[PDB]
Write a protein that binds this ligand. Sequence first.
Ligand SMILES: CC(C)c1ccccc1Nc1nc(SCc2cccs2)n[nH]1
Ligand SMILES: [Co+2]
Ligand SMILES: [Co+2]
Length: 355
Amino acid sequence: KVQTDPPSVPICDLYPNGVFPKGQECEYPEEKKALDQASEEIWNDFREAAEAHRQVRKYVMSWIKPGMTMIEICEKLEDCSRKLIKENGLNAGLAFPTGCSLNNCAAHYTPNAGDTTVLQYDDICKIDFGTHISGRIIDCAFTVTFNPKYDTLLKAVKDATNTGIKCAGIDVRLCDVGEAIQEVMESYEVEIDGKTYQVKPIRNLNGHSIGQYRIHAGKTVPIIKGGEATRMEEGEVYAIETFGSTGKGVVHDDMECSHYMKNFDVGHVPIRLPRTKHLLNVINENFGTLAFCRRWLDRLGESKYLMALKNLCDLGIVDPYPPLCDIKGSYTAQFEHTILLRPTCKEVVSRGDDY
Ligand SMILES: CC(C)c1ccccc1Nc1nc(SCc2cccs2)n[nH]1
Ligand SMILES: [Co+2]
Ligand SMILES: [Co+2]
């Protein structure tokens, strides 16, 4: 069948063949054809996760409006996301919590229980959510606004992101992408509420390589010059994301924490403490090394877990990821896409007709 208005038909039931739509294929800036064909089931897994992301976001953009609480926006997005991705434990599901960072806050903000924050008409909200199939994660995000005064800011970041996406490729030095991204970003000048600004990349923020069940696999893609000359290799997966800002161009820890994630390199740790032991078991069964948030714990009937979560954090078993905000009064925007460095070409797998 086809997709229903409010989606509900999982993406695997819409492509009975098992073959999923391919992302935009780009030529980098026979044999390495067989090498690509060999990892097809993997590429395909990424694609299924991407089609889910495209349909979920198109839905969100249809109803996101000032007046709705942040909690309402995230639960509504996630419920659709679970459906289309056809959540199945760790085989299929949500790669990470729905980021909806507001204004000066650039990333990693998702509401915890009791948050009464309401989306406003002048807010610049960054929606960042991920879907995965067998750990093949799709990290893709866009910015939402209602007041056109941000229009040029959004175009700057979007243009910077696609610039980074175009400069990416096998053997491409990582610091050149960063340099490229910045040059485009700072070529934009905007005016918001009577004041003008030259958009500046958030220097301490950046794209990253992606591994199975591992959102941030190790390498970083700067969005400013002065980065590392390390090159992108064949077969790597990257999250190309840029952040524009009218503030200082640097984020810092701010607000209450909501995102958490088990340290990928830590092994089995014996825990005798009742509640801490239980919490860890819950994290291992439900999220493994995938990031989660407090709402996803309440959702599982867990309560009285804050201290256990803290214990796990102090044990280095779980790392917290607090919201990252620029200075009060500044505005930040973001655009992100996941790319596949295949042997035959560069594929912006999460590309849509929207962005
Ligand atoms: C902030 C910085 C670039 C960062 C540090 C460590 C892990 C992941 C990310 N990136 C990222 N996260 C996301 S969405 C949700 C997540 C929250 C915490 C980890 S993943 N998009 N990009
Ligand atoms: Co992201
Ligand atoms: Co990312």
